[PDB]
Amino acid sequence: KNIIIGAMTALITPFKNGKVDEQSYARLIKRQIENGIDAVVPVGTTGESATLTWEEHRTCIEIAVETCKGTKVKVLAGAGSNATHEAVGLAKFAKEHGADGILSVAPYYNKPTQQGLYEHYKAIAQSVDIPVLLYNVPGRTGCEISTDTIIKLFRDCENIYGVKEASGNIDKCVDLLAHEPRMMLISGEDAINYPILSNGGKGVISVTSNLLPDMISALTHFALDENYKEAKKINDELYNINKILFCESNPIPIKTAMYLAGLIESLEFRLPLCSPSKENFAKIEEVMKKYKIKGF
């Protein structure tokens, strides 16, 4: 299978006066490239995909594709929906905009059955010829892609090559790779990046890497090179910031941190997301001081 693995960043989407700051978006991706990142994920959850128009989806994907051109950094585009017909269309659009692959979130809110999840992703995989990474995050979607469903999709569909897991369930990570060791298990939960990698996961899709791309890329590359002592050391150092970046729902804390670091010009969200509380604003700022933040 064609795969997209390694250290990846779920990119924030900076806003300035209610519009996507396209220059800031390009500068942030170039910053990721210069700090060892292997792929970027535009318009995912951390990028506020729910509140972006389709034209803004296309713009962000195009900026990512063309900023990464000629650098070997891949673009794993967020392209998913809780309506299969729409998810198929988003997969095709992402392929047309130049993405190297897609990250396709499990259907949220309508709680499909395992059979429904299988038919959903099978329709997506058959619509394109680029890699498809499943995304399991039951705390947000209200459903879970079971291990049996993930493994069936991996084996039955050429393009489906693994799964991003954000489920706080290292037992499931053992379950997946013990029964199907050929799949690419990707960490979607920064605080446990090292445990997932040390069990044979092959990458991360990171929130923290928006702020500390060098540290997350180093962590991942230490781990893939089987230097677990050094990968764990970074994972341990990062725990405090990895936890504070979820003191409110992602991406509220990470955008706050990027703003505090001078990496984006304005702390702007689209409703229903909004600024954190003043208490959590102060907590984020104090935790950041312990970390060396790369500039541009």
Catalytic positions: 135, 164
How far apart CA 226 and CA 42 sit, in angstroms, is 29
**Residue 112 interacts with which of Mg ion, its own copies, none, CB < 5 to 8 Å by class:** its own copies
Bridge partner residues of 77 (DSSP): 102
CA Rg value for the chain: 18
Cβ 275 vs Cβ 284: under 8 Å: no
**Residue 120 interacts with which of Mg ion, its own copies, none, CB < 5 to 8 Å by class:** its own copies
Bridge partner residues of 165 (DSSP): 136, 187
Site string for its own copies, 59-88 (x = CB under 8 A): -----------------------xxxx---
**Residue 277 interacts with which of its own copies, Mg ion, none, CB < 5 to 8 Å by class:** its own copies
User: Is residue 274 part of the contact set for its own copies (CB under 8 A)?
Assistant: yes
The length of the chain is 296
Under the rule (CB under 5 A), what is the footprint of Mg ion? 22, 38, 225
User: Is residue 12 part of the contact set for its own copies (CB under 8 A)?
Assistant: no
CA atoms within 13 A on the CB side of 89: 9
How far apart CA 227 and CA 230 sit, in angstroms, is 6
> Which residues are documented as binding site for pyruvate?
46, 205
Cβ 67 vs Cβ 29: under 8 Å: yes
User: Is residue 47 part of the contact set for its own copies (CB under 8 A)?
Assistant: no
Q: Which of residues 90-129 bind its own copies (CB under 8 A)?
A: 105, 107-113, 115-117, 119-120, 123
Binding residue for its own copies, selected from 23, 266, 277, 282, defined by CB under 8 A: 277
Q: Which of residues 138-157 bind its own copies (CB under 8 A)?
A: 139-142
CA atoms within 13 A on the CB side of 186: 31
Part of the chain binding its own copies (CB under 8 A), chosen from 165-173, 202-210, 271-279, 282-290: 271-279
In degrees and rounded to multiples of 5, residue 142 shows phi and psi of 80, 5
| Other beta carbons less than 10 A from residue 110's beta carbon | 11
Residue with smaller CB distance to its own copies, 203 or 251: 251
Residue with smaller CB distance to its own copies, 273 or 293: 273
Task: Tell the smallest beta-carbon distance from residue 19 to its own copies (Å).
Answer: 13
How far apart CA 194 and CA 187 sit, in angstroms, is 9
Residue with smaller CB distance to its own copies, 12 or 219: 12
How far apart CA 48 and CA 267 sit, in angstroms, is 13
Part of the chain binding its own copies (CB under 8 A), chosen from 32-40, 188-196, 222-230, 245-253: 245-253
How far apart CA 15 and CA 256 sit, in angstroms, is 12
Task: Tell the smallest beta-carbon distance from residue 106 to its own copies (Å).
Answer: 9
Packing angle of the helix pair 278-288, 252-260 (nearest 10 deg): 60
**Residue 225 interacts with which of Mg ion, its own copies, none, CB < 5 to 8 Å by class:** Mg ion
Q: Which residues bind its own copies (CB under 8 A)?
A: 45, 48, 50-51, 82-85, 105, 107-113, 115-117, 119-120, 123, 139-142, 248-249, 252, 270-274, 276-277
